Amino acid sequence: PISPIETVPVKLKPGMDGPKVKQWPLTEEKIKALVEICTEMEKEGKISKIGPENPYNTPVFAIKTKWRKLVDFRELNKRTQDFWEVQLGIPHPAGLKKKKSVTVLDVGDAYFSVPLDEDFRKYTAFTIPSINNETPGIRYQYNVLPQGWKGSPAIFQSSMTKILEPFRKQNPDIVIYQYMDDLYVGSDLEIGQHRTKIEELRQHLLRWGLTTPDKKHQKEPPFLWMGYELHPDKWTVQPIVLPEKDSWTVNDIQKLVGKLNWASQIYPGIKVRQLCKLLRGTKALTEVIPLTEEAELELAENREILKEPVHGVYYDPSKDLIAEIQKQGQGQWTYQIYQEPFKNLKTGKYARMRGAHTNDVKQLTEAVQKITTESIVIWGKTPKFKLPIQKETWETWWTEYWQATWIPEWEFVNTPPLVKLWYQLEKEPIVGAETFYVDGAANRETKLGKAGYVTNRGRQKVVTLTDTTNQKTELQAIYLALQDSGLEVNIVTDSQYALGIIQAQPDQSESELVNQIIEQLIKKEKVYLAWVPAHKGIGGNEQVDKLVSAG
Amino acid sequence: PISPIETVPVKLKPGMDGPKVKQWPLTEEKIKALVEICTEMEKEGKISKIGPENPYNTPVFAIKTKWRKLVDFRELNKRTQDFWEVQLGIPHPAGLKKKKSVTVLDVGDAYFSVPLDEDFRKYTAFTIPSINNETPGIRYQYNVLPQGWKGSPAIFQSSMTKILEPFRKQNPDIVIYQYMDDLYVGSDLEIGQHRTKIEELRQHLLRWGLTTPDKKHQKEPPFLWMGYELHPDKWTVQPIVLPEKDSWTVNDIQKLVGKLNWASQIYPGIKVRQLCKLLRGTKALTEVIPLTEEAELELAENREILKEPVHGVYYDPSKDLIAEIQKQGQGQWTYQIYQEPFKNLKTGKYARMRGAHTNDVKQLTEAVQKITTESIVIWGKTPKFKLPIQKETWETWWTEYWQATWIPEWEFVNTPPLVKLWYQLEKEPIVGAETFYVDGAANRETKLGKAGYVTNRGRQKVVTLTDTTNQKTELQAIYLALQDSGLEVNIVTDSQYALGIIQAQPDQSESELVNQIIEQLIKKEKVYLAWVPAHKGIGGNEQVDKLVSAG
Amino acid sequence: IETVPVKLKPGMDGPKVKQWPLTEEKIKALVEICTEMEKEGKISKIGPENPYNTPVFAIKSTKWRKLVDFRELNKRTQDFWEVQLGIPHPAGLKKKKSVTVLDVGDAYFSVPLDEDFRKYTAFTIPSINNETPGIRYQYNVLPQGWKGSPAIFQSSMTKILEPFRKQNPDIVIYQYMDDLYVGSDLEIGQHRTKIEELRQHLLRWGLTTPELHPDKWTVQPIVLPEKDSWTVNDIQKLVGKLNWASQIYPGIKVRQLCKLLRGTKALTEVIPLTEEAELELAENREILKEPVHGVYYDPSKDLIAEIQKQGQGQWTYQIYQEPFKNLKTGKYATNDVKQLTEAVQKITTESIVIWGKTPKFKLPIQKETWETWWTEYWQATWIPEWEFVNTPPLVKLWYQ
Amino acid sequence: IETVPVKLKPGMDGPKVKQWPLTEEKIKALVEICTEMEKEGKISKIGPENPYNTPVFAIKSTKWRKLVDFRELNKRTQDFWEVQLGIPHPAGLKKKKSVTVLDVGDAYFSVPLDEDFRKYTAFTIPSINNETPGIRYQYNVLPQGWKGSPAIFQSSMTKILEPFRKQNPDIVIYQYMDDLYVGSDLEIGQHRTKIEELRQHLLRWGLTTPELHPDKWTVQPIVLPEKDSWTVNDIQKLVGKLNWASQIYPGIKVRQLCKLLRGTKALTEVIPLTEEAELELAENREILKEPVHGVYYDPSKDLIAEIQKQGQGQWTYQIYQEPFKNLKTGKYATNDVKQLTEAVQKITTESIVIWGKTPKFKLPIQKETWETWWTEYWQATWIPEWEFVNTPPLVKLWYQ
Ligand SMILES: O=c1ccc(Cc2ccc(Cl)c(Oc3ccccc3)c2F)n[nH]1
Ligand SMILES: O=c1ccc(Cc2ccc(Cl)c(Oc3ccccc3)c2F)n[nH]1
């Protein structure tokens, strides 16, 4: 059928006219299949013969027992207005409330069951060519949403939504999820009452031109849907087989990571870092990459996690969400969300590096943020967090840091390794400690550096660097001062860059130099870092700039 | 059976002792299945009961009608020596010589058919626990390559190779490819003579402990192997379905790109750039990403390419290889390799950016290099290239550039768009053209810039920049000079950085500033660029440094 | 009661901005509000042939309220509300003893919106877990939060206010977005009595209506401390403040203080403050009380606000058009985000009073944190521009 | 005929370096050579219990030849061939009129290799399209290309050469890797007659054997042109050369020349060369003929060679240990890669003669291009270290 629903008005893009594409001479087999297929559509109202006055045209093709009409709408598509996006997201199973019964209905001939705007139909004109193009072809236009046209997905889903609205209003306890040609209908009715309700939905859908399968054809839970398996009172990802291979190609490792990532929604503790590190560089798709030992280690631990099947639970809005995060190595974090202790709704991980340099406190907060946004999407509220960080550690860090942040309700849970700051810079200069005035200088052309210092105790030193920038030399200077000083030291720099990095108490960095600075800072008992303006003739800074400025 | 082949001697890592891991108390069902499974292996020589003197142990587990013994060799693996990699690569079908007949033989119980080093067996000790661990467990050790042990893949393939060597030597026209448990055997014998030869291979393999399937169980070509389909006189990738979706998740786009990339080995003209651009940023795995119009455009063109099936041919060493490259948009290149015009052996693409700034000539040469290395891998020789660049264009560029390069035998082919340089910097200063002395200055702390110039005709100008580095201001200066000058201009800078970038005639850049400089350079009729040392009191450079040095 | 045509210009399409995820209570709040608005004819459901989108949020007492984020539409429609139908800003408003801010956005729902422009006002109520496709609407009347609304309505507003202005010619009234800023020099009781009088005027035209002291706004100076005794470190910080201050203020001097730091000294070492130094220092303090010589508001340039977190609930800020050429500086003083959103609102309100427009903010906070939380505490009817920046720790130090 | 124990040190495992793809003719060449070597007992097939790998290549007349790349093993075994069994380098070798380079690597196959060390010499003949798993071998005798080979063999080499040295005490012989460098001051015919005499000595110990003029090696100076008339541009380039030269050479002066460039001049404008300038300039030329004052070979530091492509088949180069503190400069003058590999071999040969070791090269070429093509033209028995660098276009200009 063709739904009696009102059409959606459709326009071409402001400046543009409809498509006038030439029909390629087709093969008799193909011309024959197209005529057959079109006759059948004509007799069901889907298409209509049109006069030669209509100046528009789109190419048509047939491809294989079985013949398929394929219309190339590329030009029309370029010419037709933009439409509203069909969805902002897909549902996550963890977000679904458990229903006593759920049925899948698939709408038959979805697009062809929905009318196209009368004023737009002319632009969907196409021509079945005659044998060797000798004579005028047979001309049609669509009365319904064509396959491959830009507006079909959007106009269909919108039509289905208008059509469903009344049923939804008079059945507010039934949940219907629309997904392409499919309808997933769930209720907490007794099985017999449910099947009655499905039947009057099917009737309501038939009233509006949409056919649906009989009960003997309706699919049984578990439903495979979008990479998930949806069971009566649990869900999981579809089965993951990590293939056994002697040689791993770039392509296999890509696919492995994709599956592990997908698996991480419900399998806790999955890691992907060491496998990801292999894919760096520019290697052929079919090129074999020797697994490192760390990749080997990571892959084996993933296999232990995946040996026993794991499932998630559905959502119950009468309870709170609790999110827990564990640190699993550098950069890597892992989380579980549950309502009742250890019956997970879902699982996940966070690896991301924000910036070049960071610390565990910063990372945890970023992980809390990612999980917070995720929870508002899936459940429409934030969870209560349980974090492996002391309130005192957190308090100390964010009250002193210069960025604003704020995480919602959380509690400490002793699940080591614990997040802690590994050093703390002093608030005041240190009495009885040597002041190192540092500086770095690099020739822009020869890339030849001088990093060094002078102290208040008369110590002076100037090393020679090669292929460094000005930024590296100012960091090299600070490193020298750390290496050559006691357990307590004041350091004076004229580099705001160096200062910024170090004042954020990083404990982790992409830069090698910075990691060496971190090692030192950890070993010190007290460090005070200070800044002065360059070339302003300041005592100490002037003295060092001399011996550092050489070439 | 257990091959009579001599064992490979195996060591633990120098400092380490064998594993002493404790057996977790198991379930009766599991204890029962393990005893059953072990009895059966014992009766076939695979494992042997051992005394309580052996101090080593590895955990064992059973997992599901069907019971599977799973030994957790993680600790042993950490402790056992490194082995030689099993392969440097896998064969590409395009490289395969066509055989009249090809059979697949799969070795049954591969690992368990190969002996383990007598001196190493003790480290493979494991314990079937008693009910509730009350009494001493039953103790075994492996006589053969265990499943999950680190050396099994390597020792197996090496064993198979030693075993095959003689047969290979006395049958130099047969081709045998080893891949895990599988053997692919090809010949140019008549079908009856072939089956005889397969049978004496099977006999030779049985002599050395390796069972293989009977003729009624041998697989028929086409062989699915490693994502390819291998037909009697053609090959292709396995069928690719680009799913129709209303909403694309990060996960779907990842999988789409993987399939397109895989498809690009034989389907020409496939693109992935616009789809890849979407995956940038840090988005959830299940997050929907609206397709841009360019992504939409790219996806539709990929669908046209994939509508009709395409195949590749096998290799004939009696002919030359010809490689052709076409430019398909910025950054993107496409290639076909064939021996007879348009019967492709294989296909591919190259997108990569080497550096921040580049030109089409540089890119083409990088594409020629990638294809050159690929051809030596697959065919052991370099192809004759057919390139969309004039000999004169190439000659001019590489004779003048400061890097060395060299591509093998090639010819021009007029398949537009043609690779050309879009501008050329002058070799000598230009008479009757205005000299712009440029300079850029940035405060390291406030990030406040001054880019400007002075000319020999007395023109002076100094703009104000904000949140720029010193490098950006020196580029901004050059851009100003280009904007405010005639069709001919000399420009003098003290920035080696700016010079380097521009002297390479880039026509494409990651930097916005650089692309604006490129637009200008293209529109000029003549540009001469020059360098002088900063702060050396050079006329013009000194005059500009004044008005540029302000804050 | 008959519509004013609206353009975008030739080549700039409408907004296509994503809807940021909303919590359940806010979503439910929005569908109540919207179902009512539809029944009242103010908005209409729309179909997928409208490709445009503007985000919506719900904010606050117990009354929820709809807040549409027209920042994009406003940029794309700037020629209309600024040059074609501009509302002049009175310089006198900042001079007043007391300024009261009244919400007048209800008045805009009475005027119909140009039918050719309605599509550009599309928005979306999303659903939890994307379970239902999300409810789509556009406006049939002048929407709150769009700058075209007051632009269009100003003709009516003048009628409405004519009696009140005529009877109170030393009270200044200024419309900005959905607010009326009403300033006077009256004593506070008389000022408040006049505000209530104004509500009654407004109440006759349908608008049931939901105290700044700008004359007592004085720049927060860069503070040079006075000390018992100065360490080497202390002077280095003083030279640092003054140095960067001298890039803003004509006449700032550090030469004397700089000689006091002779060579390679201990940071901890006390130093005698020379009379030449104490002179230069006292003269620097004088310069820092006064406004910056050389800086002026340029009506064609955007305002920019930077905010530094100073700890202990203290926030400092600077408004400028060219970096560091400050037009205004101040401070503000419960969690970081809550306070930051308070600072932003206070700064924006001041800016509206002073220059008749809102600055683009440089916020010291992670994008996602801000986006998750800002509407939890936001009270205003407008939303200013923001980007997200890492504060240089030195700029924080120089402003206390 | 009985082996010398070999170590790596405690904590540095053997080489695990990948085999770079080889063309068919080279692969076939290698399996012939290797099948023979195995029959002769020199190498043995190995199994997968040997995790190590060193790359192999084939080079050239019609005779192919095996070239193993022991650069890694050499680094990891440095204490043995350098400090434990070092070969002293004679300073006199560079002073000789003529130096002849003889290949003596055949001699090493006669000595057995320490059984505990053999595993570290593993290599792999790969196959086309990875069709067969690839043939694995290790050495049973001292391998060509390993620095331990001459280290171990030097005791025998001394015996072999004793008669020749005793009879010709003003000829200097130096062993480096698989070569003997033989220098004399004899007239060329007499030099050549002595080389043949040496071959016959060597021939008695099994070694069937396959002309530098170092005294006539003189540094390529930084060239200051002499000109009819100087443009502003010309002097700017001269000031540029001299400027960067003054970072190498004590005493270089540009002050005079710099005043000649007064203000904002046309690059094309001709300028009269002042006498003060022509003086400074002529004195600069004198400094640039002589070697750099202050730079010395440091035996504990690695040598580094930079090469610039000058166009028209011209190549310039510099050897140094600290950047730009040049120990030597030169030039070299068919495709780019071919020529570059010629330059590299000439520079390495000079370095061996002069300091007794080879530099790490900074090559102006794409990694992959170099790797694909270098063995197509490489003639030497050794391979130096290289990295791949982008030439700064100014450094190219300053060296002509
Ligand atoms: O018996 C069951 C089985 C699953 C569920 C969870 C559940 C509840 C309601 C509906 Cl519409 C479901 O169907 C969906 C299927 C795919 C995506 C979203 C929803 C769904 F999967 N509830 N009860
Ligand atoms: O009939 C055919 C079918 C395919 C071929 C190509 C060909 C030739 C020889 C062998 Cl061992 C083949 O088997 C292989 C299978 C997978 C990988 C490599 C080789 C193979 F695929 N040759 N003749």
PDB file of N, CA, C and O and ligand atoms in Angstrom, chain A residues 91 96-100 102 175 177 184-186 225 230-232 314, ligand 1:
ATOM      1  N   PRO A  91      19.912   4.077  20.807  1.00  0.00           N
ATOM      2  CA  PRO A  91      19.830   3.683  22.216  1.00  0.00           C
ATOM      3  C   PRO A  91      20.912   2.700  22.608  1.00  0.00           C
ATOM      4  O   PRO A  91      21.306   1.860  21.797  1.00  0.00           O
ATOM      5  N   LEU A  96      17.938   0.721  28.520  1.00  0.00           N
ATOM      6  CA  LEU A  96      16.591   0.163  28.333  1.00  0.00           C
ATOM      7  C   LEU A  96      15.987  -0.352  29.643  1.00  0.00           C
ATOM      8  O   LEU A  96      16.642  -1.064  30.400  1.00  0.00           O
ATOM      9  N   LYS A  97      14.736   0.026  29.902  1.00  0.00           N
ATOM     10  CA  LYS A  97      13.978  -0.536  31.016  1.00  0.00           C
ATOM     11  C   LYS A  97      13.499  -1.935  30.625  1.00  0.00           C
ATOM     12  O   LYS A  97      13.076  -2.152  29.487  1.00  0.00           O
ATOM     13  N   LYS A  98      13.582  -2.887  31.550  1.00  0.00           N
ATOM     14  CA  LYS A  98      13.184  -4.265  31.259  1.00  0.00           C
ATOM     15  C   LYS A  98      11.670  -4.357  31.036  1.00  0.00           C
ATOM     16  O   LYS A  98      10.884  -3.895  31.872  1.00  0.00           O
ATOM     17  N   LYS A  99      11.273  -4.921  29.894  1.00  0.00           N
ATOM     18  CA  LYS A  99       9.863  -5.209  29.621  1.00  0.00           C
ATOM     19  C   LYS A  99       9.595  -6.708  29.753  1.00  0.00           C
ATOM     20  O   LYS A  99      10.467  -7.534  29.456  1.00  0.00           O
ATOM     21  N   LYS A 100       8.388  -7.052  30.192  1.00  0.00           N
ATOM     22  CA  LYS A 100       7.966  -8.456  30.276  1.00  0.00           C
ATOM     23  C   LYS A 100       7.953  -9.113  28.891  1.00  0.00           C
ATOM     24  O   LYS A 100       8.367 -10.257  28.739  1.00  0.00           O
ATOM     25  N   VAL A 102       8.678  -8.262  24.507  1.00  0.00           N
ATOM     26  CA  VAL A 102       9.154  -7.405  23.425  1.00  0.00           C
ATOM     27  C   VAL A 102       8.998  -8.128  22.081  1.00  0.00           C
ATOM     28  O   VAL A 102       9.465  -9.257  21.924  1.00  0.00           O
ATOM     29  N   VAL A 175       6.464   0.766  25.094  1.00  0.00           N
ATOM     30  CA  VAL A 175       7.642   1.410  24.538  1.00  0.00           C
ATOM     31  C   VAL A 175       7.870   0.905  23.119  1.00  0.00           C
ATOM     32  O   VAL A 175       7.972  -0.304  22.875  1.00  0.00           O
ATOM     33  N   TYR A 177      10.434   1.488  19.916  1.00  0.00           N
ATOM     34  CA  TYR A 177      11.639   2.070  19.345  1.00  0.00           C
ATOM     35  C   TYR A 177      11.667   1.849  17.834  1.00  0.00           C
ATOM     36  O   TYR A 177      11.545   0.720  17.364  1.00  0.00           O
ATOM     37  N   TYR A 184      10.474  -1.965  17.455  1.00  0.00           N
ATOM     38  CA  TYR A 184      10.653  -2.833  18.611  1.00  0.00           C
ATOM     39  C   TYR A 184       9.641  -2.418  19.654  1.00  0.00           C
ATOM     40  O   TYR A 184       9.700  -1.304  20.171  1.00  0.00           O
ATOM     41  N   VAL A 185       8.698  -3.305  19.947  1.00  0.00           N
ATOM     42  CA  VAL A 185       7.567  -2.963  20.801  1.00  0.00           C
ATOM     43  C   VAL A 185       7.635  -3.778  22.085  1.00  0.00           C
ATOM     44  O   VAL A 185       7.652  -5.011  22.044  1.00  0.00           O
ATOM     45  N   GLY A 186       7.687  -3.082  23.217  1.00  0.00           N
ATOM     46  CA  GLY A 186       7.802  -3.724  24.520  1.00  0.00           C
ATOM     47  C   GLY A 186       6.723  -3.275  25.480  1.00  0.00           C
ATOM     48  O   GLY A 186       6.292  -2.116  25.448  1.00  0.00           O
ATOM     49  N   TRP A 225      20.697  -7.053  17.431  1.00  0.00           N
ATOM     50  CA  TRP A 225      20.450  -5.688  16.969  1.00  0.00           C
ATOM     51  C   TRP A 225      21.684  -4.827  17.117  1.00  0.00           C
ATOM     52  O   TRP A 225      22.140  -4.586  18.229  1.00  0.00           O
ATOM     53  N   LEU A 230      19.980  -9.015  22.712  1.00  0.00           N
ATOM     54  CA  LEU A 230      19.033  -8.511  23.702  1.00  0.00           C
ATOM     55  C   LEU A 230      18.147  -9.626  24.252  1.00  0.00           C
ATOM     56  O   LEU A 230      17.125  -9.956  23.653  1.00  0.00           O
ATOM     57  N   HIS A 231      18.542 -10.186  25.397  1.00  0.00           N
ATOM     58  CA  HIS A 231      17.823 -11.298  26.046  1.00  0.00           C
ATOM     59  C   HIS A 231      16.733 -10.790  27.000  1.00  0.00           C
ATOM     60  O   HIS A 231      16.714  -9.609  27.329  1.00  0.00           O
ATOM     61  N   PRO A 232      15.811 -11.679  27.434  1.00  0.00           N
ATOM     62  CA  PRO A 232      14.678 -11.291  28.298  1.00  0.00           C
ATOM     63  C   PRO A 232      14.999 -10.434  29.527  1.00  0.00           C
ATOM     64  O   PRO A 232      14.210  -9.547  29.859  1.00  0.00           O
ATOM     65  N   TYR A 314      19.559  -4.635  32.470  1.00  0.00           N
ATOM     66  CA  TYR A 314      18.753  -3.524  31.996  1.00  0.00           C
ATOM     67  C   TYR A 314      18.557  -2.530  33.128  1.00  0.00           C
ATOM     68  O   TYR A 314      18.927  -2.796  34.269  1.00  0.00           O
TER      69      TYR A 314
HETATM   70  O1  LIG E   1      12.216  -9.211  27.313  1.00  0.00           O
HETATM   71  C1  LIG E   1      12.850  -8.188  27.142  1.00  0.00           C
HETATM   72  C2  LIG E   1      13.980  -8.169  26.289  1.00  0.00           C
HETATM   73  C3  LIG E   1      14.643  -6.980  26.152  1.00  0.00           C
HETATM   74  C4  LIG E   1      14.167  -5.865  26.875  1.00  0.00           C
HETATM   75  C5  LIG E   1      14.847  -4.523  26.745  1.00  0.00           C
HETATM   76  C6  LIG E   1      13.977  -3.791  25.762  1.00  0.00           C
HETATM   77  C7  LIG E   1      12.862  -3.086  26.212  1.00  0.00           C
HETATM   78  C8  LIG E   1      12.038  -2.425  25.316  1.00  0.00           C
HETATM   79  C9  LIG E   1      12.353  -2.494  23.964  1.00  0.00           C
HETATM   80 CL1  LIG E   1      11.396  -1.710  22.767  1.00  0.00          CL
HETATM   81  C10 LIG E   1      13.453  -3.193  23.514  1.00  0.00           C
HETATM   82  O2  LIG E   1      13.720  -3.226  22.191  1.00  0.00           O
HETATM   83  C11 LIG E   1      14.772  -2.543  21.680  1.00  0.00           C
HETATM   84  C12 LIG E   1      15.553  -3.152  20.707  1.00  0.00           C
HETATM   85  C13 LIG E   1      16.632  -2.483  20.157  1.00  0.00           C
HETATM   86  C14 LIG E   1      16.927  -1.195  20.586  1.00  0.00           C
HETATM   87  C15 LIG E   1      16.147  -0.584  21.560  1.00  0.00           C
HETATM   88  C16 LIG E   1      15.065  -1.254  22.112  1.00  0.00           C
HETATM   89  C17 LIG E   1      14.268  -3.856  24.407  1.00  0.00           C
HETATM   90  F1  LIG E   1      15.335  -4.530  23.925  1.00  0.00           F
HETATM   91  N1  LIG E   1      13.106  -5.967  27.643  1.00  0.00           N
HETATM   92  N2  LIG E   1      12.466  -7.068  27.786  1.00  0.00           N
END
